Design an enzyme around this catalytic site. Sequence first.
Site, PDB file in Angstrom:
ATOM      1  N   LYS A 119     -12.285   5.159  -4.158  1.00  0.00           N
ATOM      2  CA  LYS A 119     -12.815   3.881  -4.699  1.00  0.00           C
ATOM      3  C   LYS A 119     -12.086   2.732  -4.007  1.00  0.00           C
ATOM      4  CE  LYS A 119     -15.736   1.848  -7.610  1.00  0.00           C
ATOM      5  NZ  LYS A 119     -15.996   0.647  -6.782  1.00  0.00           N
ATOM      6  N   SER A 137     -12.573  -3.787  -8.423  1.00  0.00           N
ATOM      7  CA  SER A 137     -13.622  -2.808  -8.810  1.00  0.00           C
ATOM      8  C   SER A 137     -13.026  -1.424  -9.102  1.00  0.00           C
ATOM      9  CB  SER A 137     -14.675  -2.730  -7.763  1.00  0.00           C
ATOM     10  OG  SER A 137     -15.448  -3.920  -7.799  1.00  0.00           O
ATOM     11  N   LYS A 173     -13.212  -0.090 -12.678  1.00  0.00           N
ATOM     12  CA  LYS A 173     -14.382   0.684 -13.173  1.00  0.00           C
ATOM     13  C   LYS A 173     -13.968   2.136 -13.445  1.00  0.00           C
ATOM     14  CE  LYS A 173     -18.032  -2.137 -10.975  1.00  0.00           C
ATOM     15  NZ  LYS A 173     -17.230  -2.999 -10.075  1.00  0.00           N
ATOM     16  N   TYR A 183     -25.447  -1.230  -7.141  1.00  0.00           N
ATOM     17  CA  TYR A 183     -24.048  -1.489  -7.569  1.00  0.00           C
ATOM     18  C   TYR A 183     -24.018  -2.809  -8.343  1.00  0.00           C
ATOM     19  CZ  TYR A 183     -18.941  -1.449  -7.484  1.00  0.00           C
ATOM     20  OH  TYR A 183     -17.632  -1.413  -7.858  1.00  0.00           O
ATOM     21  N   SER A 217     -11.826  -5.133  -4.687  1.00  0.00           N
ATOM     22  CA  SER A 217     -11.357  -6.462  -4.234  1.00  0.00           C
ATOM     23  C   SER A 217     -11.569  -7.481  -5.352  1.00  0.00           C
ATOM     24  CB  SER A 217     -12.048  -6.868  -2.961  1.00  0.00           C
ATOM     25  OG  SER A 217     -11.772  -5.937  -1.923  1.00  0.00           O
ATOM     26  N   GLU A 276     -16.447   7.662  -6.441  1.00  0.00           N
ATOM     27  CA  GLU A 276     -17.401   8.112  -5.394  1.00  0.00           C
ATOM     28  C   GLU A 276     -16.937   9.484  -4.906  1.00  0.00           C
ATOM     29  OE1 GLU A 276     -17.403   4.915  -2.520  1.00  0.00           O
ATOM     30  OE2 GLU A 276     -18.098   3.513  -4.089  1.00  0.00           O
TER      31      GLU A 276
HETATM   32  C1  LIG Z   1     -15.304  -4.882  -6.749  1.00  0.00           C
HETATM   33  O1  LIG Z   1     -14.312  -4.925  -6.104  1.00  0.00           O
HETATM   34  C2  LIG Z   1     -16.483  -5.815  -6.444  1.00  0.00           C
HETATM   35  N1  LIG Z   1     -16.013  -7.157  -6.147  1.00  0.00           N
HETATM   36  C3  LIG Z   1     -16.183  -8.216  -6.937  1.00  0.00           C
HETATM   37  O2  LIG Z   1     -16.864  -8.196  -7.965  1.00  0.00           O
HETATM   38  C4  LIG Z   1     -15.490  -9.503  -6.517  1.00  0.00           C
HETATM   39  N2  LIG Z   1     -15.517  -9.921  -5.304  1.00  0.00           N
HETATM   40  O3  LIG Z   1     -16.590  -9.348  -4.576  1.00  0.00           O
HETATM   41  C5  LIG Z   1     -16.821 -10.099  -3.364  1.00  0.00           C
HETATM   42  C6  LIG Z   1     -18.067  -9.492  -2.727  1.00  0.00           C
HETATM   43  C7  LIG Z   1     -15.603  -9.897  -2.466  1.00  0.00           C
HETATM   44  C8  LIG Z   1     -17.077 -11.600  -3.695  1.00  0.00           C
HETATM   45  O4  LIG Z   1     -16.747 -12.445  -2.835  1.00  0.00           O
HETATM   46  O5  LIG Z   1     -17.605 -11.869  -4.799  1.00  0.00           O
HETATM   47  C9  LIG Z   1     -14.692 -10.282  -7.445  1.00  0.00           C
HETATM   48  C10 LIG Z   1     -14.443  -9.927  -8.725  1.00  0.00           C
HETATM   49  S1  LIG Z   1     -13.641 -11.212  -9.501  1.00  0.00           S
HETATM   50  C11 LIG Z   1     -13.484 -12.060  -7.993  1.00  0.00           C
HETATM   51  N3  LIG Z   1     -12.769 -13.202  -7.897  1.00  0.00           N
HETATM   52  N4  LIG Z   1     -14.117 -11.470  -7.007  1.00  0.00           N
HETATM   53  C12 LIG Z   1     -17.283  -5.268  -5.288  1.00  0.00           C
HETATM   54  N5  LIG Z   1     -16.489  -5.359  -4.052  1.00  0.00           N
HETATM   55  C13 LIG Z   1     -16.984  -5.632  -2.851  1.00  0.00           C
HETATM   56  C14 LIG Z   1     -15.935  -5.756  -1.754  1.00  0.00           C
HETATM   57  O6  LIG Z   1     -15.765  -4.781  -1.062  1.00  0.00           O
HETATM   58  O7  LIG Z   1     -15.358  -6.820  -1.671  1.00  0.00           O
HETATM   59  C15 LIG Z   1     -18.332  -5.770  -2.569  1.00  0.00           C
HETATM   60  C16 LIG Z   1     -18.754  -5.640  -1.320  1.00  0.00           C
HETATM   61  C17 LIG Z   1     -19.403  -6.108  -3.569  1.00  0.00           C
HETATM   62  S2  LIG Z   1     -18.803  -6.243  -5.261  1.00  0.00           S
END
Ligand SMILES: *C(=O)[C@@H](NC(=O)/C(=N\OC(C)(C)C(=O)O)c1csc(N)n1)[C@@H]1N=C(C(=O)O)C(=C)CS1
Length: 356
Positions: free
Chosen positions: A310, A62, A65, A148, A313, A270
Site C-alpha cells: 500500500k 491512504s 485505509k 479508488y 500520501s 493490494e
Molecule cells: C491516499 O494517499 C490518497 N491521497 C489523498 O487523498 C491526498 N492527496 O492525494 C493527492 C492526489 C496527492 C492530492 O494532491 O490530493 C490527500 C489526503 S489529505 C491531503 N492533504 N492530501 C491517494 N493517493 C494518491 C497519491 O499517490 O498521491 C493518488 C494518486 C490519488 S488519492
Amino acid sequence: PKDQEIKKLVDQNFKPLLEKYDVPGMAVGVIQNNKKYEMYYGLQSVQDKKAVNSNTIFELGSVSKLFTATAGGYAKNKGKISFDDTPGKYWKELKNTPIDQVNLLQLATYTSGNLALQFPDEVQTDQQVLTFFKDWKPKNPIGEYRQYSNPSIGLFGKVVALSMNKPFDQVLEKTIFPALGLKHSYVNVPKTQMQNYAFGYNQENQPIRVNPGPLDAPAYGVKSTLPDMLSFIHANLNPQKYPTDIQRAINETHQGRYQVNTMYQALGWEEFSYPATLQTLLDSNSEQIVMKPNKVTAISKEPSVKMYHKTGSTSGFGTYVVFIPKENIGLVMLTNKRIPNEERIKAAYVVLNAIK
Ligand SMILES: *C(=O)[C@@H](NC(=O)/C(=N\OC(C)(C)C(=O)O)c1csc(N)n1)[C@@H]1N=C(C(=O)O)C(=C)CS1
C-alpha cells in the site's frame, strides 16, 4: 551482522532519495524473522531542528485505509456488522435512500458505481456529508466497477463506528491500535505528543499538516511512528500470534475480493502473486488503475503464495508498506515530503530481494 547488511542496503537504495527530491526527513524499517531494523535520516522539523527518531509521528495518508479495513474485519468477526448489510441499517438517516442498496464490502472495495476519488469541495460539515449521501443516486451498475474513492471507504468507516457504538477515532485509539500493540498511533495527536509530530513539506519545502476533512480519519487521517508500523507489519506477517478477535480481523484484510489485471483487491491491502516482477508492482500505481474506473473480474484461481503493499500520501508526507508472508519479511518507508510512488516501490524491491 544482519544489522550492518540491512543498514548498508537501505543507505544505498533509500538515502539517495533525500538529496534527489530534497526530503527533510525519512524513516525506513525492515522486519525479517521477527527481528526489527530501524533507520532514521534527516529532520522531523526544519524550523525546530529536530532529528527524525523512533518517536517521530508521520501522516500515513491512504495507508490509513489498512486500519479502517482491520476495524471492519474486527467488527464483522465479532458479529457487529455483515459485509452483505447496507449503510441504512446503522446510519438510520440513510434508510430508504438510493445509497442504501450498496453493501458494506462494495463501499470498502470502491465498487459503489458513482463515488469519485474525493468529495466535492463544497462538502465539509457533518450535515453536508449526510446530505451528499441522501442525495446520492447510482450511475455504473453497483459492484461491477472499481474507482479508488476516499468517500467510499469513508462511509464504510463511519458505518463500522456506528456498529460498535463509538466515534471512528475511538474505534482505532481504544480497540484496534491497543489490540495490535500500537502505543504511538493516532487519529488525533494529543497535546503531549505534538513535539514528536513531524511537519510535512510541500514541493516548495514549506511546512504543511493534513487539514480536517469530511470522513478524513478512515480514508487518510491516521498518524504513526516507525516502531508502531513495524509492529503492524509483524501482526500482518504473524496473525496466529495474536488474540482471536484481532487475528480474524487481520486475516479478513488478506482475502482478495476481486481482480483487475495482475492486482487482487483485498480489504485495504493490494494483493499480488509472489514472486512479483517490479513492473507488476509499478502497474498497481499506474494512472489507469488509480485515477480511472476499471471493470472488476471474479477470482478464478486464488494465488497460492501472495504478497501485499500500500502507498499513501498527504500534501506533505509519503508512505509505503509491503510484506511477503512466505519470506517472513516486510518494509515500511515514511517521509515528511511526497516522493514519486515508483521510487518507493523500486527502492523497497531492491532491498527486499537483496536481503539474505
Ligand atoms: C491516499 O494517499 C490518497 N491521497 C489523498 O487523498 C491526498 N492527496 O492525494 C493527492 C492526489 C496527492 C492530492 O494532491 O490530493 C490527500 C489526503 S489529505 C491531503 N492533504 N492530501 C491517494 N493517493 C494518491 C497519491 O499517490 O498521491 C493518488 C494518486 C490519488 S488519492
